[PDB]
Amino acid sequence: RQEPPKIHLDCPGRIPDTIVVVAGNKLRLDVPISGDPAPTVIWQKAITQGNKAPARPAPDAPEDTGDSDEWVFDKKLLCETEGRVRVETTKDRSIFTVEGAEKEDEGVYTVTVKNPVGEDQVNLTVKVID
């Protein structure tokens, strides 16, 4: 009995989902969203490797090491550490402010907004500068 959730703000409906930091610096990200009063914007991460349905991308065997991820095995439940990353949802929007977004955080992310009326999704681009 509220408003339909959506990745929109007041008109252009364009959430600047872009978290950037200078490698080990205090970064703050603010993005307005729909939903009322407070929706559920979960900040998800994306490594664009190869999953979900099938796909026929371009054959570009890129030589590399392939060791950016790790063996988390179970599900990482401890997200916000004591002083590593702080992600909280404001009263009517999502905020991504982390003071340690290193190369391990760089890559791509997919934030999802949900509520009792509906749900939406979007991609967040990250970039750690030195």
- Regarding the domain delimited by 1-130, which CATH topology (the fold level of the hierarchy) does it fall under? Immunoglobulin-like (2.60.40)
DSSP summary character for residue 91: T
Q: What technique was this entry resolved by?
A: NMR
Question: Half-sphere exposure (CA, 13 Å, Cβ side) for 52?
Answer: 6
Given a contact cutoff of 8 angstroms between Cβ atoms, the answer to whether 99 and 20 are in contact is no
Residue that has been written with the tokens 């252009």 in this structure? 12
Locate 90 and state its tokens: 């404001």
* CA angle (128, 77, 71) in 5-degree steps: 70
Task: Sketch the domain layout of the chain as residue ranges.
Answer: 1-130
What are the residues facing 120 on neighbouring strands?
113
**How many Å is the maximal CA-CA distance in the chain?**
53
Distance, in Å, from the CA atom of 69 to the CA atom of 63, rounded to the nearest integer, reads: 17
Contact between 30 and 92 (Cβ < 8 Å): no
What are the two backbone dihedrals, phi and then psi, of residue 65, each rounded to the nearest 5 degrees?
Answer: -100, -40
